[model samples]
Target: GLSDGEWQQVLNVWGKVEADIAGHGQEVLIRLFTGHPETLEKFDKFKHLKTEAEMKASEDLKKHGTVVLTALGGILKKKGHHEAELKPLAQSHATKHKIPIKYLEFISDAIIHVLHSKHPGDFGADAQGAMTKALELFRNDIAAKYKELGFQ
Candidate 1:
């Protein structure tokens, strides 16, 4: 239950993280999504991509599961942050590096498409707000990991 302004702060933080990743490719980008464990478990829709038919049937799942990342890809590509279309290049990099290319592959493209076709701005106020709410729910889980380190 964050205020609108507080939500914007979360969105602003994500924007900066995305920009940093775009500027210098990183091994991993961690995102926090807060929700009821039952609801968040729905993302398991993506776990089935290990199989071929499942992968095709769940195309919708991939697009929706990782839409934000795809938007980041589109933003970076549009800004000419990379040498080519972010999706194909990322795929090629993974393949060449012998990394498993699975249901996760299409997420970047889907996100970019999401941003271009949906947001198309430096930031989307509505999308930012929604993400903030999700993050608020997730905050406790995030904090728990650090709790053992004595963070109160």
Candidate 2:
């Protein structure tokens, strides 16, 4: 759960996306709203787009780092990946937390890259399974670590 004092922070983040959607449309809006599975479904719904459009959107989002970053955060959060946020901070936070930053970074980058590199609207099983494994392994590792630390 978000911190007790952080609800407004979450709402503030959501508000911007909400406004962006209000001005834009659901195609992009849904990308912000849905989890990976639902976003993949949305992608399939629009997969009929010409390859040019697919490539264009992909390239555009890549160049638009903020938009891509926000979409990534939303997608990973929705996917229920616990390490999604921490993995990035691992570089600076891991030592303090007694975890390996390098391993976390490698795994995080791989997981995020796989999930985000799709044709704007195509979701293949191979891609899904690949991303799922990274997430599952990260989750299992954290759980095991906590158990070793005597966390309840």
Candidate 3:
């Protein structure tokens, strides 16, 4: 878990992106799917989107993208108990979504990248380390869930 200062920093940055969580979510997934095609395979809805233009045009992509950010936003609100909501998601990723937990780390990076690129003034080098650590907690919690699910 992050220190209070670090989580507050994360929440501050989330404040900016949270304004348009859906748009940020779309860009995060776009960045991820562009860089990692295999990850695209995890989503039956998004698998057919090959071109960036096509991905941009996708309603399903937008829908799922909202879901990804909404999860993070839910955590930011302290609604998920952070790990409590994450555990259910982890179970689904393992059994239903069939996502390798490792991809979560990648998505975490992608989310940070989008935030930094989009809001340099708010989330720059000063903020990167905190964000990384914050998401590591997220990934670690999910990893624990995966371990329970026999992912390892």
Candidate number achieving the greatest lDDT relative to the actual structure: 3
Give the residue spans of candidate 2 off by over 4 A: 1-119
For all predicted structures, in order, the TM-scores are: 0.23, 0.27, 0.92
For residues 125-151, could you state the per-residue lDDT of candidate 1 as single tens digits? 665554434433333333333343343
lDDT of each: 0.38, 0.41, 0.81
Better of 2 and 3 by lDDT: 3
lDDT of 2 by residue, 5-113 (tens): 3433433333444454322232342333232322232334444544434633653333443444454445444434445554444333333434333433443444344
What tens-digit string does per-residue lDDT give for candidate 3 at 68-139?
Answer: 888877876672258677778889888988888779878998988898788877677657877788788778
Number of backbone-clashing residue pairs for each candidate, in the order shown: 5, 1, 0
| Residue 76 miss distance in model 2 (angstroms) | 15
Candidate 3 TM-score, C-alpha based = 0.92
Q: Report lDDT (Cα) of residue 19, candidate 2.
A: 50
Among these predicted structures, which one has the highest TM-score?
A: 3
lDDT of 1 at 11: 55
In the predicted model 1, the residue pairs found to clash are: 34-138, 70-111, 70-112, 71-111, 71-112
TM-score ranking from best candidate downward: 3, 2, 1
